[model samples]
Target: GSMLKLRQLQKKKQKENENSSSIQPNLSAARIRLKRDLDSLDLPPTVTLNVITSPDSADRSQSPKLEVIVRPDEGYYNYGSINFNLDFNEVYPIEPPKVVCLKKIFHPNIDLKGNVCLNILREDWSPALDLQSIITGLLFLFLEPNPNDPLNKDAAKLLCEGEKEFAEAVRLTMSGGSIEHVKYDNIVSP
Candidate 1:
């Protein structure tokens, strides 16, 4: 019975070209372009962003590295998880998606309130926006930010006025020794 049902579903999906890539229609083309973009990307060694196909993505032996999970969307951008959800709507590619960091982080641009103020995700967004661009933006956020417009006032305060305090906060968060509440994900354990 299960086999028969699965066969029927497959046939139907084939006819509709549905689920060609993870059942996400809105993101299929975008993701393909994003993949190509990542592949052809050129950057300095100081900033490294490598896209991996599997969640179990392996680390590169080279130094100065960062990994990214480039998931396309159906314009919904339900893209929220781990305190960083990027929700898109009909106006996406035209209007920016709502960048919500569901989980709390200690980034200057990303306040504890979960607001992500990235130019690409906002006024700077265009149909040209792709996965690598988003990754670069995210990576850049970790390194630099416009703290004046902060979602988490505390992190902003420390970052803007107290560099040492901000450094300590970042150290504490990255250490992950005492922060039992922060999340990594269900599949992976922090």
Candidate 2:
């Protein structure tokens, strides 16, 4: 399901990859990026965004950090919304924003400290990418977990070999149960 959506976004991105034949607008990148982050809050059933600062001071370099909570339409377990914290640097667009995890999750790519292993936040980052691009990559991980490259070794091991047991562990962790002494987020749905 996520792949289908990813393909759709790629198609749109490819279409926009063309060179402009007319005069380009002089909009500020900071304004555009912040607007994108603000816009994400309005989208339904995918993810929700909250600006930690007031709208009046939203475009500043010290703009309020963003809190992103994901609600994948395909549903999930053990994990709740893949929560995140993002802070835009003053030289943004020329550099990628800083992102941190605000909630604990039991996933291969996400660590207990809330550090994420998404490529977009690292080496693959470019001025063209926005918050939506980062969100899409995070959602893709939920759709398809990567075991080879991992942050949590136990989760990677479970996903790689212990298919049924993996789910049990997720449920255990999410229900306030411990997996090998590490407590996970108690986000189980009633």
Candidate 3:
């Protein structure tokens, strides 16, 4: 009976090892939700989404990273392209994804260091919100920048002074010129 019990225990351990192998997909709730949300994306014409890294490798535990390009056709940011990097973690949806501007642009909500100041990215985040919501919010920032809650005070101040000054500043920065010694990238699309 003791020999039979030892054989059963060994079989159980083998089964557990097989189940925990790297070949199996990580079927966590977060990964499932992310897949559904990604498949349901209906992006605007001006917005383009690209997967920087997919989770199809042996190390499926690694989360995916996405790149979003936003080109506002009917706003102060028209013709200028901006890139945003989205990094999803193991606890996505429950916690908002980390969004970072990939370029140095003159914007009220985006700082020189690429830190974004969006409500949904912080206090207003909810589990109900999806990736589309975040992209829409980013597009709105270019359409109508919020000077009241600004990450770049200088840009916000210029916007508050007058639209003309702000527009000029935006133009200057978009052309890869320096504003107050801070050089900006030439993000103008051909």
Candidate 4:
């Protein structure tokens, strides 16, 4: 009975701490952190955070519109860190989140496999790196994908040599078609 009371007391104390903190565990803190990340990101209109919520009674296929979701799981998981829609593997960040191309991106970097080849997420992860950096990098890749590293070798080569064809590819992908006619510019609407 004493041990049970002590456990209850400890649990109560932790809950109280969470309620008082500006970071309301995972949810409020996740939103706040994401907003800050987005603002600091200076995202172009084309690269925006798509928010997706669930109805209490709706079809399951309605995965949130956003590709990334930082689920709250107490202190066991990163309370406020962002998580991407990775392939179903247990080895999360350490294994590199498979940032799939949902909207069929027609770009030099994003390949047919939907595997985004960002250095930060793949190889450049540091303790200081945040969600903002990753998102910003992704946005940058859309504007100017690095051809040297070459995730999509064909796209990279085409981008380097035939700029016209590359644009078409990007267009096709954005339009949910084959790899053709994609245009790249700063005209993305917010």
Candidate 5:
């Protein structure tokens, strides 16, 4: 069943690519830019990326969506697994791709609703920035989650209390525990 699913996914991806190429004939500027970025992608050992294409024609003009999984080797979130989803529209390089966390975890930069507060994804975004830059920025968040600027106020408040307290809370939440009754996903890697 797993193998069948894999084969299906591959066929779907292939078909989508064919459809995209046939419709445009020449690759769009966004697709060309994205291809360049993808070709030069240099992710760290702690981070992995998966390209996901939709069969739906509505997404034909969009670049393949990306699923990034980061496993921090050090810091408060060490050994924890975090997932992020990225979607690049036709405007791609002109507009920063939309990214969202896939799990509800305790972190100052990522909220329970999966919204992220990364500067590069917002005002700091530049056409010069590529996939590698975004991925590196995300990994950095795990190594040192910024509390000064936060999406999760509670997580930031705890971090502000002190690293010791924050670390404990992170541990609790990473193990699928709750903080003030707000449950978190167990993102700890077995």
Candidate 6:
């Protein structure tokens, strides 16, 4: 009885995977947009976009995943480099691309899990918004962290208390040190 149930569960999962695969969009449009962005890209000296290539040689038809790496502009509290893995599905212009931070850093807007708390990435997403728009918004977060709206409550609470204190905490955390038992990535400047 247990073996039969296990086999049924495996079949159900396989069916779901097959269905989900069909829903993904083609990659031609994504390739075009990626080319345009790379050609006319403008960024501060401190920030850059790391190139990403598709790893699935067996499935050339799959929608290409766009991953972008961002480094905070210098002269501000540098939080090391971060990666944004973007998923452009079949409903992409209609639906916002899913964004995930691929680094562990300390920031009021970025949680330990690398989840960002930016409105444009979620509630404010619109079909008109492009990849550049999302990248620009991320830069803004590095320049000015909003304490009122935050994913990392501890960092937010620290910021709300005082600017000097906040600066110190950011500095300490960027050096790969822990603040009040919470671990943060070391992003110390060279």
Which candidate number maximizes TM-score?
A: 3
Each candidate's TM vs. the true structure?
A: 0.50, 0.73, 0.86, 0.50, 0.83, 0.72
Model 5 lDDT tens row, 29-127: 676787788889888789998878531333455566889999998999999999999888878788978898999999999888899899998899999
lDDT-best of 1 and 3: 3
Clashes of 2: 0
Candidate-wise lDDT, in order: 0.49, 0.69, 0.86, 0.49, 0.86, 0.70
Cα shift from native, residue 167, model 3 (Å): 0.8
Question: What is the per-residue lDDT of model 4 for residues 31-113, given as tens digits with 9 covering 90 to 100?
Answer: 33434444565544334455444211122233222454332222211122222453312232244334665433445566556
Span of 10 residues, lowest total lDDT, candidate 3: 53-62
Deviation (Å) of 88 in candidate 1: 8.2
For model 6, the local distance difference test gives: 0.70
- lDDT tens string, model 6, 96-145? 56778876777889888878888997789876777678778888887888
Residues 1-190, model 1: lDDT tens digits:
6999999998975754544343433333333443455566665333443432321211112111124332222111112223244443434345544556555555556655667778787667887776557766765565454587676565677777666667666556544422335532221123
Off by over 4 Å in 1: 1-28, 43-103, 113-115, 177-190
Per-residue lDDT of 1-190 in model 3, one digit per residue for the tens? 6999999999966765565585763565666777778899999999999988653332345677889999989777898999999988878889988999999999999998899999999899999999889999999999989998889988989999998888989999999988888999999969
Between candidates 3 and 6, the one scoring higher on TM-score is 3
Q: In candidate 1, how many Å is residue 14 off?
A: 10
In terms of lDDT, the poorest run of 10 residues in model 5 is: 53-62
After TM-score superposition, the amount by which residue 129's alpha carbon in candidate 1 deviates from its true location, in angstroms, is 4.0
> For model 2, where is the 10-residue window of minimal lDDT?
18-27
Which tens-of-lDDT digit does each residue in 54-161 have in candidate 2?
A: 333423334546777775655335235567888776466677667887667778888999888888887899888777787777777777778877999989998877
lDDT value for candidate 5?
A: 0.86
lDDT at 128, model 2: 80
Quote the positional error of residue 148 for candidate 4 in Å: 2.2
